[PDB]
Amino acid sequence: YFGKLESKLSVIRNLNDQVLFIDQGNRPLFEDMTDSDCRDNAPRTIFIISMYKDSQPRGMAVTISVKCEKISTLSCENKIISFKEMNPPDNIKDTKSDIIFFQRSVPGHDNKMQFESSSYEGYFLACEKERDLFKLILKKEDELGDRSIMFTVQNED
């Protein structure tokens, strides 16, 4: 079971320094943004990372939320990434959740993070280029040192 500890404002970037954002169709996308662009698109680029206590510790348990039309929380339900209209809850009864990800620092860096699905072991949050768009997806670790599943969390310490 999970218990909410705190919620903090953060900006998420891939290894190309492209910042994670919610577009008009509520799609989690990645694009090149200066500190100016990032500031002008603030409700769509500022994410709420909520930290949870876990009765079965196996990585920093987190939810990822954003304020658009309403508070939306990131879900990997049926191994598909989407933002569902809900607040990060105070308590989660199971040992697995479609909105709970395990945040881990990549041994290569103190900056680089990875987000593994609690409900789908071996599946990670990833940036994948589809046509001319950089999309937030859920995938199995394709290879060792895969940069597509690595991110930076800017919470300014």
Author numbering: 1 to 157
Task: Show the paper's wording.
The IL-18 structure essentially does not change on complex formation, maintaining the β-trefoil fold that comprises 12 β-strands (β1-β12) and 2 α-helices (α1-α2), as previously reported. Our previous NMR study showed that the residues 34 to 42 are flexible despite partial α-helix formation in this region (residues 38–41). In addition, two isomeric forms that originate from a cis or trans peptide bond between Ala42IL-18-Pro43IL-18 in the loop are equally populated in the solution structure. The flexible nature of the segment produces a variety of architectures, as demonstrated in several crystallographic reports, including a loop with a trans isomer22, an α-helix with a cis isomer21 or, primarily, unobservable flexible loop with a trans isomer2022.
Interleukin (IL)-18 belongs to the IL-1 superfamily and was first discovered as an interferon gamma (IFN-γ)-inducing factor in sera from mice with hepatitis stimulated with Propionibacterium acnes and lipopolysaccharide1. This proinflammatory cytokine is secreted by various types of cells and strongly augments IFN-γ production in type-1 helper T (Th1) cells and natural killer (NK) cells following activation of NK-cell cytotoxicity; thus, it plays a critical role in inflammation and the host defense against microbes. IL-18/IL-18Rα/IL-18Rβ ternary complex formation juxtaposes the intracellular Toll-Interleukin-1 receptor domains of IL-18Rα and IL-18Rβ, to which the adaptor molecule myeloid differentiation factor 88 (MyD88) is recruited presumably with the aid of TRAM6. We determined the crystal structures of IL-18, the IL-18/IL-18Rα binary complex and the IL-18/IL-18Rα/IL-18Rβ signalling ternary complex at the resolutions 2.33, 3.10 and 3.10 Å, respectively.
